[PDB]
Design a protein around this ligand. Structure first.
Ligand SMILES: NC(=O)c1ccc(NC(=O)[C@@H]2CCCO2)cc1
Ligand SMILES: NC(=O)c1ccc(NC(=O)[C@@H]2CCCO2)cc1
Ligand SMILES: NC(=O)c1ccc(NC(=O)[C@@H]2CCCO2)cc1
Ligand SMILES: NC(=O)c1ccc(NC(=O)[C@@H]2CCCO2)cc1
Ligand SMILES: [Zn+2]
Ligand SMILES: [Zn+2]
Lengths: 360, 360
């Protein structure tokens, strides 16, 4: 039994639990059960499952070094799978709602869930709500008698909140802070003064890193009852750093990876996003180049999108990416070394996370 | 110190806690804090606060009969206020998202939050997410060391999920069940076969009654450590029944209360909602009347809305409302009598809830 095979098997089991519960306790009818099954599948499956499988991988590294009865090892792996699904369903929730919020068209060779003919925004907003409620139902059912229930729910809660805060930072990142005002329609910045490395960092740290790196790592510790094998400030530092590095590749790919090759036509430029490319370009451009950027950024007009795309090529942003990458490698290695002091095993799992981020 | 005065004072305190936490732990800037303060105010204030004040009222009925130190009485009232705010913020969350989902224009003498100029749907979806995350932050902070933390979070979780399920039942109530299919755009029913008292009941029970009646009642018990003063199956039965009766008045008002007098132009007819009026009309109409209903319902065309409005008047729906009301009075009195066996005090609080629903 490979890890992935176990993880996918547990999806069937959770799906059955949730659907059967809807029938026995929520008076659901079969057609609505079927609608929700389809919703779940469509939104929760696809890709590599780095997030969920990280929880499994962390727990398996502790299983290798820790004495347990076989039935305990099974229970720990089952808990890691359920906790990894809780993170995948949280990712579903985000994606569903973010797609609606941003007017996205495609995700994973498919219409964004809201664009399905028999879905609509009216239903999809609520479907995304359901996705996140399911995470809670899973935790309370599978982890009812577990000693880590409280800590897990508290952590999940804090990660979710960070993530929502991050979405707000992301969707407001093209406005001037001093002009945010519910009463006044928001103009795009003209100075780009808030396109800085520190503001960019704040966006990415909240929007992505808590749920993509910190949560899978700490959930793997909690289901292993191993949170005292580690210095949590180290776990936070390394998660946030790897997560930022991940998002700097994403930002670079939103612009430069061909559309079918990426699965979604990129719109960061036309959305005036505070991307790594824009911030880094503004960090090195001359006066005439800054003025040229201001004249073209944040416009749906493809010819102006192409101008921004050109200034990024003239500016040799690959040099800055390589230099950033080399610093993140130093720093991530340093963190891993510090994590070995208390736990070689957990340090190794972090090393695997990093390899999966970097080499990919 | 009146109860309402205490309840409103605690809003200031929670608001300060949440905003200060955003600054000290989430790197928020002042303008974004201000945006979120405004959001909170706009979405969480207004009206009578029946839901939040029910928690306070239930706890005050137990305080009257239970021996405690003064500092305990204060702590219990403070917990009841915080728990009542958790319910008001859950109501905020619903309203924000439901308004977006349904394309509503007005709420409480104001544009629906999403329609504010500097809000937009792109931000308001996430703002509604934040509203519900705040409920959790409040519980974990104010109730950290409380014996009822677990039970409260579990109850809140189950109520939230019921409510989301209910929204799905509501938004799909004009489709035929056998034709729900994410792949196929959903036609309005032509037979109206699912406009029955039992299907109507299922909608209202999930969509409204768990969060509006069951949650405030059980939260008042939990913060009072009094959940063994009561037979919970009775609390459920009475909550669901009063809640349904509430929603049958709402349904009647969506059609018949003038727009400024109601605060929002009603659209149940044009939305083809499974309302009490439609179900009850179909329950007594003759053949020609049913055919006339089918020809006019669920159309934005005001002249057809007026036809439906006319058939409802010809059909003397007030007779059915009075008869329904008289049965609910019997049944609610019966429940209250049964609740007195274990708790006169809690039975009285239920009697007040009922008076506030019925007489109003
Ligand atoms: N077409 C869609 O609306 C849609 C496609 C994919 C996702 N999610 C994912 O890609 C990751 C992988 C599993 C968890 O979320 C969500 C929605
Ligand atoms: N790094 C940045 O995000 C940033 C820094 C400076 C500028 N603009 C200028 O350097 C000139 C001087 C006045 C007008 O534009 C814009 C952005
Ligand atoms: N204009 C709006 O968008 C808006 C107005 C009112 C509400 N909420 C309420 O009326 C109840 C009362 C407090 C909790 O929810 C939400 C939004
Ligand atoms: N109570 C209902 O919701 C309901 C029951 C019956 C009908 N239609 C009919 O009675 C005739 C007989 C065949 C065509 O229409 C519609 C609705
Ligand atoms: Zn987005
Ligand atoms: Zn609605």
């Amino acid at each position: 039994m490979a890890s992935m095979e176990r993880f996918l098997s547990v999806y069937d089991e959770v799906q059955a639990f949730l659907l059967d519960q809807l029938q026995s306790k929520y008076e659901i009818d079969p057609n609505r059960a079927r609608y929700l099954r389809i919703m779940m599948d469509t939104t929760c499956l696809g890709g590599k499952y780095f997030r969920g499988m990280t929880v499994v991988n962390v727990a398996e590294g502790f299983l290798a070094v820790t004495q347990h009865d076989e039935a305990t090892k099974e229970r720990i792996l089952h808990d890691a799978c359920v906790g990894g699904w809780m993170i995948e369903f949280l990712q579903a929730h985000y994606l569903v709602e973010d797609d609606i919020m941003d007017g996205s068209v495609m995700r994973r060779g498919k219409p964004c869930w809201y664009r399905f003919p028999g879905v609509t925004t009216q239903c999809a907003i609520n479907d995304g709500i359901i996705l996140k409620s399911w995470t809670q139902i899973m935790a309370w059912h599978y982890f009812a008698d577990r000693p880590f229930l409280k800590d897990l729910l508290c952590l999940f809660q804090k990660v979710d909140y960070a993530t929502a805060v991050g979405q707000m930072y992301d969707v407001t990142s093209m406005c001037d802070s001093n002009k945010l005002d519910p009463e006044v329609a928001q103009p795009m910045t003209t100075d780009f003064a808030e396109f800085t490395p520190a503001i960019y960092k704040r966006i990415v740290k909240y929007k992505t890193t808590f749920y993509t790196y910190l949560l899978p790592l700490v959930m793997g510790l909690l289901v292993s009852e191993a949170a005292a094998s580690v210095e949590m400030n180290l776990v936070e530092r390394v998660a946030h750093l790897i997560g930022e590095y991940f998002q700097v590749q994403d930002d670079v790919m939103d612009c430069f990876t061909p559309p079918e090759q990426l699965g979604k036509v990129g719109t960061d430029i036309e959305d005036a996003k505070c991307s790594w490319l824009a911030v880094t370009f503004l960090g090195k451009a001359n006066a005439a180049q800054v003025a040229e950027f201001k004249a073209n950024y944040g416009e749906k007009d493809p010819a102006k999108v192409a101008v921004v795309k050109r200034l990024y090529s003239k500016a040799n942003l690959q040099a800055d990416f390589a230099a950033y990458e080399a610093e993140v490698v130093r720093e991530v290695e340093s963190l891993i070394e510090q994590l070995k002091v208390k736990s070689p095993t957990f340090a190794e799992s972090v090393a695997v996370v990093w390899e999966k981020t970097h080499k990919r």
